Amino acid sequence: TMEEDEEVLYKVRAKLFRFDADAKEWKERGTGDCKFLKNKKTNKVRILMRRDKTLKICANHIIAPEYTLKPNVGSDRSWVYACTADIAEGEAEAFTFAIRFGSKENADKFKEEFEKAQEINKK
Amino acid sequence: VQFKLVLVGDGGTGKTTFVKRHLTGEFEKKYVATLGVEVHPLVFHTNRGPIKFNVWDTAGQEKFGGLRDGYYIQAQCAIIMFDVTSRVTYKNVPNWHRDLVRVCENIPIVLCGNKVDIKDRKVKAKSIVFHRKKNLQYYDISAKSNYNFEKPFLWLARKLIGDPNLEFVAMPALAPPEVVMDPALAAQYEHDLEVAQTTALPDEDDDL
Amino acid sequence: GSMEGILDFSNDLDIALLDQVVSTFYQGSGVQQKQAQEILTKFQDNPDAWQKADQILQFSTNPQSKFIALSILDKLITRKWKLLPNDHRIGIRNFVVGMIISMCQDDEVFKTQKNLINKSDLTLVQILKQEWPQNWPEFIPELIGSSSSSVNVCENNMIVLKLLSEEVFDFSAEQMTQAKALHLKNSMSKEFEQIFKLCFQVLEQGSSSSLIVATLESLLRYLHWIPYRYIYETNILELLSTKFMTSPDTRAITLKCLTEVSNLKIPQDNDLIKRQTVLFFQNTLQQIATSVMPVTADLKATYANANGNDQSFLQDLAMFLTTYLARNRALLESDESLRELLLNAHQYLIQLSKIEERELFKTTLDYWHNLVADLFYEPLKKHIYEEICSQLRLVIIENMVRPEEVLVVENEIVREFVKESDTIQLYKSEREVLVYLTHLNVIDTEEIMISKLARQIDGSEWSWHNINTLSWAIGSISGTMSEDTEKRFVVTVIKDLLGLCEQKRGKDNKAVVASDIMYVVGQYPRFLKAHWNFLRTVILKLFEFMHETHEGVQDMACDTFIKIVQKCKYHFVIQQPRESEPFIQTIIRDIQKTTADLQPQQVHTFYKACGIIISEERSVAERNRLLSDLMQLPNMAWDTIVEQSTANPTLLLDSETVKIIANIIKTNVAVCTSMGADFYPQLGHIYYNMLQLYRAVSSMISAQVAAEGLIATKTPKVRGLRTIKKEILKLVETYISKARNLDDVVKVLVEPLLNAVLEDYMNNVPDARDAEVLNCMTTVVEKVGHMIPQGVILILQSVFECTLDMINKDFTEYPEHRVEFYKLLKVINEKSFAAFLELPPAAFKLFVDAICWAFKHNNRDVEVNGLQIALDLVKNIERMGNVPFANEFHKNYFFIFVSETFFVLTDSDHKSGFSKQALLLMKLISLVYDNKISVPLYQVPQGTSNQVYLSQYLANMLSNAFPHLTSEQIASFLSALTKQCKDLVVFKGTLRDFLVQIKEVGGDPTDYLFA
């Protein structure tokens, strides 16, 4: 499973989108628990998200300190950001992600946690 | 360990959307009729190792049928799709089954009633009985709400492997690389990003 | 690569190259597979590809290539057979027949190329459907003769006969004309006597498996239609029920034949046939008991192990026992020597009813419903099945599924996100049988439930599953006990369930028992009515659950509140003995404390429950006061946000103010839903201000779209503002749909509503128009459309042309607008047709264009209304009589409606509306042949009748749209279609015959004389 050398920092239900710049539209990528996992050895935190029933990975990347969360025009409960190395679907790809939550409260809490975890990887 | 799966049913029943949901996780709202067949590989992780389904998503529209029953040759399992909001698609289930078992005489077959997420349901659960005499497994599914969307493949994997205790397991999570952004294009990580930022997310009225 | 060379037909077909393209498609992957796919389709779709099928069958070393060659022949035989010269038809027949014999006599190819023979047999049957027997009268005799020369040829002849029986009897209704299917039907019935000889001989002597199985598989198809004497006046029943049940390689197909035998309604007066029907059931059950499994076997564990074909056999066994017993169990209930067989058969079903398999349980549950319903009415029967029913009560109670009302489900105990319509239907089916089983013995049912509840108190058998199934079973049998027995019963259950909740602590445990308490009490309102102390304690516990952290417990408490109150509202409005005031007055006062922890949409559910109670009060003054006491908090907040919003009109910028406004109108919608016409005083208190707010919100929406663009419609701010407009329209629509005082609606409500919504809809950009406007007008036209004929005209002018322009460029843009648009045009054309007579002739052309546009939708919500509007429009025009508008209509649109109806009937893309399409075309055709159109429909020699010009028009229209039809095909079809224009069943049959003939060449025009 390759999650035993890791500790869970944050868990929240969410829906993940990837931006198809060609078609200029958001495409769903997965619904499930979004987790912040801090490797106990190297202390770097990653985002790991699995789809609900099949448990396949839809997000797998370090919460790099260079990332910035921006709002999406149509939602007060979502965040948009760019990701240069995500290995959910195999080889490391680049993606513009959007993640939506059940409430603005969960979305603000995620941004708090997302930024706390950035301070961890900046060492 | 790969198995050929043919996917048949009337046009518009949701065959292509159901497969796309399993390949990428997306929900396609447009109806672009499949032309002949589209083969996609689809791998599931089980407690008995990975299993790969070579999914032959055929065309339901007669004018786009392609080779028709020629797609069924050497298939090892099958899914028959119909639309619970369309009585016609269920009256054609015996026809798709007829063409299928004349070529595939002894394979596991799932009967799926799609679009159970729509309030105005036309094919009531009480009238869906065709699978009984034909030894098909039946599932109410929805590629939109993901209701029972994993059970067609879970049942087939249990019949193809021969292990009724087979379960889906979490695929391992390899360590993700540490990479810095590209300042050669980081001045342009603001065009295709502000575009995505101003393209509204779909279905904002959902729970997620 | 260069795989396209096979598509060139000038040069010769490189058979080798073909075999590689085929191998690349089936065995390859990726682009080379897709490249080979498009090439094979184009090769197959070539009208001349069939001429190369001869050399593919000889010179190809690939079975898949010979398969596709037959797929090419199958297209030719099915569609263009009767156009070939007679020499090509004999050549293809001899070629197919010779190849089949060639593949059967090679013992090795007969084993390894099974499909290629099966595809060949099906192809031969396609020839039989065209040529036999009128041009092949010796096929069956020669087939029977060739059966003895080779055992492989004999087995394959059973496949050809099986496929021939399927195509003629099972799949002919939709693929042949009525005369063709009847012709091929009589042809097989004439020759079946000689087909049964061969089949019976092959079963009586029997070689080994393969030939027997293929014989039985073919017999399974015969049993659909063959006369009964072939089954009972021979010895084949003894062969099926004994010999072929012992060998497991013929056991499955034999069980399916005996199921088909079991499903015929015998001459229920013949003692002999009854004796044979008992006999094959007696033999079959004997073979299962000694050769398969005994009656005590754990079929639940055998099905779960999934060895070999165990699951398929137990499915087939359940189907056999249920089919036979549902039709013939009465043959075993009187004779005492058959009692053990009758009960052993049902005991097998009890064991089959313990299998964990949803769809197999619904099959056996269906039979249990058939049984207990019969025992409930038929005298002297229930005592036979006393032990079967006692076992069945235990099975159903332990396998109860979750009803609708239970919103708590285990993932972890979380809230239900999706309704499970399949689970809900299974629960209702289980409740039906368990209610019957309770009536059959209420003492046994109560003891089973009381004993199980005791072992939840004990903790002896505690679990979430066991407390849920028990609680669900207890609520399902509501109404089956006597009020006295029910009184003692539910007082117990409720007391123990409350004791269970107060005992076990836990976020999950206390939520599971809460949902079980709430389901049981919601199902027993009769008990709650006659015991106020219980009802009050129940209601207060629901209020206690409205403060729990789990939203599902809160959600269910509000829904259980509404469910109890819908039945017991009388006991909340009167002054109860030993009480200070009506309980409604107490609830209204604490309404801020009771709903303090509820989320908005659950607070509105609370208010709707209060409105149910208040509407019980019939004293107008007291009810109007109870209504005011209820609406104080939303009216207080409404008065505030109205004072400082007419002044300070920007204030509507605040997102938090938008949420407050929407929830206020949502609370007014909730109360108006339950009270209906009794809501008028509260509606009048806010109506004139609400419509101004609608105007105020409307201007900001248009302001944001101008300042930000169309993207503003997606922002949370605008979406929040539009919610206020949607909720206002929903409140107006809700009241007008339930209003009894239509005079106040017309004189007070209609004129400020149309002023506030109509031009705002017409003058907003398309992306800003709320489809709920159209939905609101439909209710207005439906309920008071006959009193505002000038209001209906105004409604049309504001919405008709601009909405039609949004939805006439494709079939998918603005989906909610299409549905409400045609719902609006339907009710206007129905209850106010005069508004269309007031349309300018150009706007009436768009109205007809809008109707035929709805024909061609595959969306049923639009397609059904479009065919209905056209039907009602024709009736409306006919009612006017012989006036200019009615004659101008038929001149300009009668053939637009006849042709556009024929287009959707024959384009193979609107099969879902065939019935309403046929009904419309029949009405149109009947107009002319009843001389209801008093003008010439042509602008043709004068004096000719509209009956004549209609037949010339339709014959010309069909000759151009279907050029492959002979003139006499079109002549006979229209002739029959005309004679039958008052007989919808035959009319629809002639149409279905026509849709068969337009798919092939050479259809017999005499087929249209079937009636």
Ligand SMILES: Nc1nc2c(ncn2[C@@H]2O[C@H](COP(=O)(O)OP(=O)(O)NP(=O)(O)O)[C@@H](O)[C@H]2O)c(=O)[nH]1
């Ligand atoms: N409401 C709803 N719509 C669905 C669902 N599944 C598919 N659809 C929709 O139905 C339409 C048909 O899509 P599609 O997958 O192409 O069906 P198909 O059977 O592959 N058509 P064809 O056989 O001609 O290729 C799409 O618009 C899709 O969004 C569903 O589960 N719920």
Ligand SMILES: [Mg+2]
């Ligand atoms: Mg498709």
